[PDB]
């Protein structure tokens, strides 16, 4: 299901599908499929550049929410192996809006923590649209401590609309849990790398994003507040979300100059959704490179550097 | 007034008084973020939401602070965190409990991810 | 409370996000009225720092 | 409300009450109150020894459950000052079946953790008969960590029927919380003293009772299982509880020989309930003496001694 501005790409795709049927549909129909396929694929490839060259911040947000995209499960599958999912906070529940586990990266063992919006409606409602109740963040703290204890690096993916705004979420110390998370992660003796795949932000995202390095795709928005919220509070409306997106600076290159993120991982054309494997390979390369130049530093120097980088936050 | 109320008299020492907003996001809202910054600064008489004042409690050294909610909802601006760090550093260098009071409506949106 | 009201599209519990409610729900230690505050901080800190008790 | 075997004591008390009325009731009645008061008090004092000399383990259990007795609140009031009650686990609730706080003992600051059955029916149901849901034990862990951090000794009172056997208690990791409690308390760098005031046991009691010293009143039962439970499972009945109490060895002197508890604090005659102030003074003296000979040892030697004492557990 392509977005509104990806229409010319769609109709060309719509002609492309029935090519399979015409191959063996009925009445002996087996036409010269290869010629038409090649011409239509050429046109489609040419047109996507005609479509994805002129997208800006409001679009970037739409693309960051494309309802066909790799979630943390997808990146785990397409760049990680021997994945073991640990579920359980030890207190009140395991949460489906966060998925964590311990896996191997090119032999090396790692910890993977991140969100999972679910693909279709069913897995979206079963995972609460990637909105974690605090018990999830307590689980994430528990896993992060486990990873710290056994001299293990931590790889974290961040793809959350935000911490759930609900009765159950507020009752259980949402603020307290996120505060603790932000406290412990800033003392681990192991390197930390955190991407911004997909749509993330709204503070709750930061619960698992305080690390040595930070990386973001080219169509991923990292906003202290969703554009619609900023629009409602400030613009006194919702339709004016694109203006809020333009003003805030939620796009990766805008953030990059702000010394906030350490690298942008380029996407396959038309969005990572068109070539999830290519995006997974790019992410794996970026993660490995980040880990490499990180392992040289010792644990004490690692923590000191982490603290120093934090203090660089804010123009002050 | 809060800091005076808690701390003893004559031992008050403000911290991070030279830190002032230095907006770079030039946030263009219905108003200009500089407009609200200046308006709040003049209306409340304080540079930012947070004030820090080293002092003493019943003869015991201590560091306190508080939020002036009137300042744009007392949002945690860059200066807010910088003064917080300054106070915590003062407490660390000189062994003395550090105290604070919370009053805010959320982080300073106009500064976005900062 | 407005955000939660629109999200859950329901009636929030009475005393929502109230200190008299967040001490009921474990997130809040002790409810102190402002007049005691300075003594309450002074006594607690003089205890924790292990200093002699303050003189009224 | 005295127990069944304290009847002769009662009726003598029942005659004693209306002495106040006869002093100024009506018809100019002001009799020679002092003579009758002295004689009846003499008889009552003589009779209690005639009553509390011949009580054994099944009784001890009844006395340990006398519905007129000092709970942890009472001992705090009558032996501690500048008491500050911290309530809150930080996760899901503060529990009324446990009361903790930070107070001063003869100038010295301490931490007090223990249970509170509530006096009457209302405060009994509001505190769940001193039965703590796990969140209570998480709170107790939190307080114990706080006390450890600031070089502060811990005084703990133990008066619980047991961890609550309920849906809500089991759902929230009861076993997990108690396991963690039993893990952390065995690593604190501060001395720990734990009494057995009132009725305690059933494992959940041990959640706050793993310390350098252990002390118990003369009418306090510390059983891995209530006598009634042991009776039901083993004796195949409930009426045979006294036999279970006799067999198990739940009485303090029986436990004392077992190298399980380090001292018994003698009670005022007729039970501590008759002279709560005397019991509070005795407890305060015992606590201070325990702390004294404990502070001599350094933190490392303290923890080593604690570990060694634990290993002495069990004849093996
Ligand atoms: C996502 C974030 O962290 S910021 C999101 C905004 N905050 C929240 O969602 C949490 C609470 N939301 C609120 O609206 C309030 O803080 C409440 C619920 C406590 C209500 O308190 P109120 O008495 O209504 O205060 P109010 O919101 O009017 O704050 C006073 C002023 O501070 C401003 N303000 C408050 N918080 C912020 C903020 N984070 N950014 C910018 N301005 C802010 C308001 O715009 C308002 O300005 P105005 O009076 O000139 O229009």
């Amino acid at each position: 299901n392509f977005l509104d501005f990806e229409q010319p790409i769609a109709e060309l795709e719509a002609k492309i599908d029935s090519l399979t049927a015409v191959s063996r549909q009925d009445e002996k129909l087996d036409i010269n499929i290869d010629e038409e396929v090649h011409r239509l694929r050429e046109k489609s490839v040419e047109l996507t550049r005609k479509i994805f060259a002129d997208l800006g911040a409001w679009q970037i947000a739409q693309l960051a929410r494309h309802p066909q995209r790799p979630y943390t499960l997808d990146y785990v599958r397409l760049a990680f192996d021997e994945f073991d999912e640990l579920a359980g906070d030890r207190a009140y529940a395991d949460d489906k809006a966060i998925v964590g586990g311990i896996a191997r990266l090119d032999g090396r063992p790692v910890m993977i923590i991140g969100h999972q919006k679910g693909r279709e409606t069913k897995e979206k409602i079963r995972r609460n649209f990637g909105m974690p109740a605090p018990e999830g963040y307590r689980k994430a703290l528990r896993l992060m401590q486990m990873a710290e204890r056994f001299k293990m690096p931590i790889i974290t993916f961040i793809d959350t609309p935000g911490a759930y705004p609900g009765v159950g979420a507020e009752e259980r110390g949402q603020s307290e849990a996120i505060a603790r998370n932000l406290r412990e992660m800033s003392r681990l003796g192991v390197p930390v790398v955190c991407t911004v795949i997909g749509e993330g932000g709204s503070g709750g995202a930061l619960a698992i994003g305080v690390g040595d390095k930070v990386n973001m795709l080219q169509y991923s928005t990292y906003s202290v507040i969703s554009p619609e919220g900023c629009a409602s509070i400030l613009w006194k409306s919702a339709d004016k979300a694109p203006l809020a997106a333009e003003a805030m600076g939620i796009i990766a290159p805008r953030l990059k100059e702000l010394k906030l993120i350490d690298s942008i991982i380029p996407e396959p054309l038309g969005g990572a959704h068109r070539n999830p494997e290519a995006m997974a390979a790019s992410l794996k390369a970026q993660l490995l490179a980040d880990l490499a130049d990180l392992d040289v530093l010792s644990t004490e120097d690692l923590k000191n550097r982490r603290y120093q980088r934090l203090m660089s936050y804010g123009y002050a | 007034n809060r800091l005076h109320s808690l701390l003893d008299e004559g031992s008050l020492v403000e911290l991070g008084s030279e830190l002032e907003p230095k907006d770079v996001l030039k946030f263009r809202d219905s108003k200009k973020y500089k407009d609200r910054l200046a308006s709040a600064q003049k209306e409340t008489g304080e540079k930012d939401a947070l004030v820090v004042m080293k002092g003493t409690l019943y003869g015991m050294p201590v560091v306190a602070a508080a939020f002036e909610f009137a300042f744009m909802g007392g949002s945690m601006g860059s200066v807010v965190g910088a003064r917080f760090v300054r106070a915590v550093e003062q407490a660390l260098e000189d062994n003395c409990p550090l105290i604070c009071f919370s009053a805010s409506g959320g982080a300073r949106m106009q500064e976005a991810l900062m | 409370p407005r955000v939660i009201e629109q999200t859950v599209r329901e009636k929030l519990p009475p005393g929502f996000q109230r200190s008299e409610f967040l001490i009921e729900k474990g997130a809040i230690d002790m409810i102190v009225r402002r007049p005691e505050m300075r003594l309450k901080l002074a006594s607690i800190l003089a205890k924790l720092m292990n200093l002699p008790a303050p003189n009224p």
Side-chain angles (χ1 to χ4, degrees), chain A residues 224-225, chain B residues 36 69 72-73 75 104-110, chain C residues 1-3:
Chain A
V224 58
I225 180 61
Chain B
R36 297 169 173 273
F69 168 66
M72 280 195 293
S75 295
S104 166
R108 190 87 65 73
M109 288 186 294
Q110 281 82 1
Chain C
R2 53 173 286 270
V3 179

Side-chain angles (χ1 to χ4, degrees), chain B residues 12 23 36 41 55 70 85 105-106 113:
Chain B
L12 285 70
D23 163 58
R36 297 169 173 273
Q41 196 163 347
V85 168
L113 205 79

Side-chain angles (χ1 to χ4, degrees), chain A residues 64-65 95-98 114-117 124 127-137 158-166 169-170 174-175 178 196-208 221-227, chain C residues 3-4 7:
Chain A
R65 308 168 183 179
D95 214 347
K96 265 65 187 184
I98 295 170
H115 315 79
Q116 178 71 18
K117 293 185 174 176
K124 274 183 176 296
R127 302 186 174 267
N128 278 326
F129 311 89
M131 313 195 85
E135 57 261 26
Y137 290 106
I158 305 178
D159 175 58
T160 181
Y164 193 80
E170 296 295 300
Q174 178 63 257
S175 305
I178 289 172
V196 185
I197 69 169
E199 185 193 16
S202 73
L206 185 64
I208 45 178
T221 62
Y222 192 46
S223 60
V224 58
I225 180 61
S226 61
Chain C
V3 179
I4 305 169
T7 287

Side-chain angles (χ1 to χ4, degrees), chain A:
Chain A
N1 320 297
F2 295 82
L3 296 159
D4 64 336
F5 74 110
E6 298 166 356
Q7 187 263 8
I9 318 306
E11 159 170 356
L12 188 33
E13 292 310 299
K15 296 296 187 177
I16 277 178
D17 306 303
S18 189
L19 292 176
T20 307
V22 174
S23 304
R24 51 179 61 254
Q25 182 186 263
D26 52 359
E27 303 192 29
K28 309 178 178 289
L29 260 60
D30 183 4
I31 77 171
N32 48 327
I33 290 290
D34 193 55
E35 166 63 18
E36 297 303 90
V37 164
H38 188 198
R39 299 299 177 269
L40 268 65
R41 262 73 168 186
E42 281 275 353
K43 196 164 79 173
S44 185
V45 167
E46 294 304 330
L47 193 53
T48 299
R49 184 63 155 187
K50 305 312 153 297
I51 279 307
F52 289 86
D54 50 296
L55 55 91
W58 151 262
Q59 303 285 299
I60 279 168
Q62 282 202 83
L63 274 173
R65 308 168 183 179
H66 197 307
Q68 190 76 24
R69 194 171 171 79
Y71 309 139
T72 288
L73 280 184
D74 294 358
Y75 287 94
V76 164
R77 184 193 64 192
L78 306 180
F80 297 81
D81 47 358
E82 205 179 13
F83 171 78
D84 311 321
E85 171 176 347
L86 317 186
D89 64 329
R90 306 287 182 76
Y92 178 77
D94 79 323
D95 214 347
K96 265 65 187 184
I98 295 170
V99 288
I102 179 169
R104 285 195 179 274
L105 177 66
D106 293 340
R108 190 172 197 172
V110 298
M111 189 78 73
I112 307 169
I113 311 95
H115 315 79
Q116 178 71 18
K117 293 185 174 176
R119 181 55 56 183
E120 56 175 357
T121 185
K122 181 58 60 56
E123 297 303 335
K124 274 183 176 296
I125 69 173
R126 165 172 167 274
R127 302 186 174 267
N128 278 326
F129 311 89
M131 313 195 85
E135 57 261 26
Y137 290 106
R138 300 205 179 85
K139 149 167 70 174
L141 162 60
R142 191 173 66 79
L143 299 183
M144 283 184 299
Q145 291 189 328
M146 186 187 305
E148 174 274 334
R149 196 177 306 117
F150 301 110
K151 283 81 172 186
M152 196 191 315
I154 304 183
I155 300 183
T156 304
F157 304 155
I158 305 178
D159 175 58
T160 181
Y164 193 80
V167 179
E170 296 295 300
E171 285 181 349
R172 298 191 283 273
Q174 178 63 257
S175 305
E176 203 280 352
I178 289 172
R180 185 169 279 161
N181 268 27
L182 297 179
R183 198 184 68 184
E184 288 293 354
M185 209 196 322
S186 64
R187 288 184 292 175
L188 305 184
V190 311
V192 182
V193 179
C194 313
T195 177
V196 185
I197 69 169
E199 185 193 16
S202 73
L206 185 64
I208 45 178
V210 179
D212 289 302
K213 300 289 184 180
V214 186
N215 320 321
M216 181 180 309
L217 306 185
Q218 198 169 0
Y219 304 152
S220 293
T221 62
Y222 192 46
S223 60
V224 58
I225 180 61
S226 61
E228 285 69 359
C230 194
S232 295
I233 291 90
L234 296 173
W235 278 249
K236 309 288 166 53
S237 60
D239 52 354
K240 298 186 185 61
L243 311 181
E246 283 278 0
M248 277 196 290
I250 68 184
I251 55 172
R254 186 78 174 286
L255 303 175
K256 177 65 195 303
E257 51 173 3
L258 263 66
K259 306 291 175 296
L260 291 161
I261 55 189
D262 285 301
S263 177
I264 313 94
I265 302 164
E267 316 183 23
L269 197 78
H273 52 284
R274 179 191 171 182
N275 194 341
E277 288 70 3
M279 198 75 263
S282 307
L283 172 58
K284 186 155 168 289
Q286 182 63 82
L287 296 162
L288 294 164
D290 297 8
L291 284 161
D293 52 348
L294 279 170
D295 303 328
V296 57
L297 298 161
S298 178
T299 300
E300 293 185 5
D301 297 6
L302 177 65
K303 289 157 62 177
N304 299 341
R305 175 191 148 292
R306 183 182 294 148
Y307 187 89
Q308 290 295 327
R309 284 183 66 269
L310 299 169
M311 302 299 123
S312 294
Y313 284 142
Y315 45 69

